[PDB]
Short mmCIF file of C-alpha atoms in Angstrom, two decimals:
data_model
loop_
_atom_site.label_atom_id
_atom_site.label_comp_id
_atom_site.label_asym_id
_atom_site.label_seq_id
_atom_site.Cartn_x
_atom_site.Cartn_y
_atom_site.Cartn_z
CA UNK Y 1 162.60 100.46 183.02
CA UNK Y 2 160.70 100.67 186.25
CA UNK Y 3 162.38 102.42 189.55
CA UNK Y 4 164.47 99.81 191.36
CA UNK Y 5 162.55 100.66 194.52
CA UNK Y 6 159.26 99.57 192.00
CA UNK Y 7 161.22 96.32 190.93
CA UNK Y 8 162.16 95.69 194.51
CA UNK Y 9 158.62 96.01 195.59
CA UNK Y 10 157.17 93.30 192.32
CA UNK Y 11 159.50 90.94 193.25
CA UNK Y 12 157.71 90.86 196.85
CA UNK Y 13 154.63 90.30 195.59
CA UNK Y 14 155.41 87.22 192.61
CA UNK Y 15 157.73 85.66 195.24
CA UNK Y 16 154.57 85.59 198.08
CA UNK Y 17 152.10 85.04 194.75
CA UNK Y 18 153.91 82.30 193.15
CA UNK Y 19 154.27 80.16 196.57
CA UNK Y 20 150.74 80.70 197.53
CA UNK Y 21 148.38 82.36 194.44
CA UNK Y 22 144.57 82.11 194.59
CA UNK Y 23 142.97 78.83 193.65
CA UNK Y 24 142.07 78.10 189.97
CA UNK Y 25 145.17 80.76 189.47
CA UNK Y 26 149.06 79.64 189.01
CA UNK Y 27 151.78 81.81 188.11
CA UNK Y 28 154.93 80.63 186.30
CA UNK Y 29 158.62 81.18 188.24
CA UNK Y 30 160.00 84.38 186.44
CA UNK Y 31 163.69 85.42 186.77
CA UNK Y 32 164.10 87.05 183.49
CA UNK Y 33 161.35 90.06 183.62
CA UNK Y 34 159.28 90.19 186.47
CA UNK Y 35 157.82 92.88 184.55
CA UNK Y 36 155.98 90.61 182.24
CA UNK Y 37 154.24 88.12 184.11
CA UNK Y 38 153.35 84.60 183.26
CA UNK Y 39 150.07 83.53 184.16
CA UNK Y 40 147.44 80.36 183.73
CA UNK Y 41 143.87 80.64 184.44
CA UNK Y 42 141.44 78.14 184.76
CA UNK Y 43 138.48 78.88 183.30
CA UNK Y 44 135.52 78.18 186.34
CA UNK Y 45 133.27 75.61 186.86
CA UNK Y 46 130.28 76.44 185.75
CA UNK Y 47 130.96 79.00 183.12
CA UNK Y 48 131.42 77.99 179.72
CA UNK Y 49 135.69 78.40 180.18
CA UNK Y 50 135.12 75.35 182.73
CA UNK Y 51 137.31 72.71 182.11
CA UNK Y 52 139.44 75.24 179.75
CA UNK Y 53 143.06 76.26 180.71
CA UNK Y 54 143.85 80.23 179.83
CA UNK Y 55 147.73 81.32 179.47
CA UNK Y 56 147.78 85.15 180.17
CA UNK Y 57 150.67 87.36 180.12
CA UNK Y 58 150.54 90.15 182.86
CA UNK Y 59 152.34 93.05 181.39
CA UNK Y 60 153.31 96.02 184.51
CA UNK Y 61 153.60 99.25 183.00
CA UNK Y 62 155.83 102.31 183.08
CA UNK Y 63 153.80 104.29 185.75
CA UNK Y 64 153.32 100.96 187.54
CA UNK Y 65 151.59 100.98 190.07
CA UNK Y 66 150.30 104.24 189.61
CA UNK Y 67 148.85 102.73 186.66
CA UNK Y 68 146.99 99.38 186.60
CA UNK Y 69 149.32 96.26 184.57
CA UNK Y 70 147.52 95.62 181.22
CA UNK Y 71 146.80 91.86 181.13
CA UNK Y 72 146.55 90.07 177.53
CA UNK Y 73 145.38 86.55 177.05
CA UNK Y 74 147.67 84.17 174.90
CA UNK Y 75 144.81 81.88 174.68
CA UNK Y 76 141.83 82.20 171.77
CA UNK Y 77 138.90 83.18 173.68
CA UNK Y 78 135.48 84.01 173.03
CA UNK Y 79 135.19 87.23 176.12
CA UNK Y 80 133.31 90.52 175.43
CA UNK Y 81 136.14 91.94 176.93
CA UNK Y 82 138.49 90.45 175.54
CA UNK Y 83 140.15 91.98 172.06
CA UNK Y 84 142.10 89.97 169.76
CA UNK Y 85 144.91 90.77 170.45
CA UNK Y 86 144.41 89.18 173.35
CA UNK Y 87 143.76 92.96 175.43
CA UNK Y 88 141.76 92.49 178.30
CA UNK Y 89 139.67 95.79 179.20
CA UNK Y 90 138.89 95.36 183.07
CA UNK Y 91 136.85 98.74 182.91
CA UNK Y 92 136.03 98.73 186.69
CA UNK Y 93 139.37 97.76 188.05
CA UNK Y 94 140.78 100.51 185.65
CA UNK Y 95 138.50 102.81 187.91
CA UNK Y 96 138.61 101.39 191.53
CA UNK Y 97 142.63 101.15 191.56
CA UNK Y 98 145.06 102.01 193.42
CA UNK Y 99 148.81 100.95 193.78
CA UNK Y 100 147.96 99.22 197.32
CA UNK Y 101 145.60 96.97 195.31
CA UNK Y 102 148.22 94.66 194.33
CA UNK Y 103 148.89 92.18 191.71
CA UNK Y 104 147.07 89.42 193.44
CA UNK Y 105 144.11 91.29 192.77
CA UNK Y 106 144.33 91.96 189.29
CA UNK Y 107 144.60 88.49 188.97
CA UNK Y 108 141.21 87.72 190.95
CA UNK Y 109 139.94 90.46 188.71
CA UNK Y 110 140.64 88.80 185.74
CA UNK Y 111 139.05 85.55 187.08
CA UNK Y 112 136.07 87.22 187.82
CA UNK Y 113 135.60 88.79 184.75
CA UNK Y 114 135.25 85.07 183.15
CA UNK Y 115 132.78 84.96 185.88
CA UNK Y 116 130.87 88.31 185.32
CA UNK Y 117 131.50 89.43 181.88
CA UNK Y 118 131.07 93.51 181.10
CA UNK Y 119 129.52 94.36 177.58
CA UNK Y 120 128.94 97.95 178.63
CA UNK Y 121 132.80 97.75 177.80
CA UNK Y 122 133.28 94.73 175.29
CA UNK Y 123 136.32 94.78 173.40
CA UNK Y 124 134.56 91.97 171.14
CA UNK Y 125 131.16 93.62 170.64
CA UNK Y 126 130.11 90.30 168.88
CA UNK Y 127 130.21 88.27 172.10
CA UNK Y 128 128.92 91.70 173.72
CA UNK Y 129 125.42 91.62 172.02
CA UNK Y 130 125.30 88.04 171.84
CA UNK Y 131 125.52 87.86 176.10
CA UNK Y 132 122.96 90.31 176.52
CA UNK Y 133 120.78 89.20 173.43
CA UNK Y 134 121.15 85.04 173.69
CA UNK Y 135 123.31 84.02 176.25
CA UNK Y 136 122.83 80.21 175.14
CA UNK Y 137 124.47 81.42 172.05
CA UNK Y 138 127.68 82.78 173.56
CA UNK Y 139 127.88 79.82 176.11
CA UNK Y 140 127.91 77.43 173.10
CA UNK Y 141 130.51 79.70 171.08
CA UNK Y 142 132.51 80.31 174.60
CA UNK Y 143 132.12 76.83 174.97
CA UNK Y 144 133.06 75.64 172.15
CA UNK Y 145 136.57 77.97 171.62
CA UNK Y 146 137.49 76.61 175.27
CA UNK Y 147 137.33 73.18 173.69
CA UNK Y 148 139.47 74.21 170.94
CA UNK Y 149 142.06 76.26 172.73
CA UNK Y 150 141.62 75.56 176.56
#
């Protein structure tokens, strides 16, 4: 139940998004809700999500934009920030936002984070210690999950 003037300004941004979105990044034509956001990420070369493809759902809230969207994964993945219910906890975008940002960023945000994982903030403390205390280990776990569900 977002303003219309809101709605009118989301449906900018996924029409420009979904013609053009950033590479490695797709999202899916929504006419229902464009307040819950369909979204496929693939996981980047040289991580261990390469190869991997990562359904998301990008969820706007009700103080959208003045809030950041709350992105959840549908895929299994083995993320420190990640939780299982699929929450992902982006704990510097949650800081450095502003409704100008956009959803394209998020988005890049989210990619990044498979990139440049946070375990100052890990939602899965388990692949938290493990990144700081053997990263071979979480690559191999990571690695293996993204066999299994990417």
């Amino acid at each position: 139940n977002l303003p219309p003037h809101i709605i009118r300004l989301v449906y900018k941004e996924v029409t420009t998004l979904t013609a053009d979105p950033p590479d490695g990044i797709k999202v899916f034509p929504n006419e229902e809700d464009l307040t819950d956001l369909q979204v496929t990420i693939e996981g980047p070369e040289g991580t261990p999500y390469a190869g991997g493809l990562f359904r998301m759902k990008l969820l706007l809230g009700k103080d959208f934009p003045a809030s950041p969207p709350k992105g959840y994964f549908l895929t299994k993945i083995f993320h420190p920030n990640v939780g299982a219910n699929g929450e992902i906890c982006v704990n510097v975008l949650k800081r450095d936002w502003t409704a100008e940002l956009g959803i394209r960023h998020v988005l890049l945000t989210i990619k990044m984070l498979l990139i440049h994982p946070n375990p100052e903030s890990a939602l899965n403390e388990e692949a938290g210690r493990l990144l700081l205390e053997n990263y071979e280990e979480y690559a191999a776990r990571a690695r293996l999950l993204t066999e299994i569900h990417g």
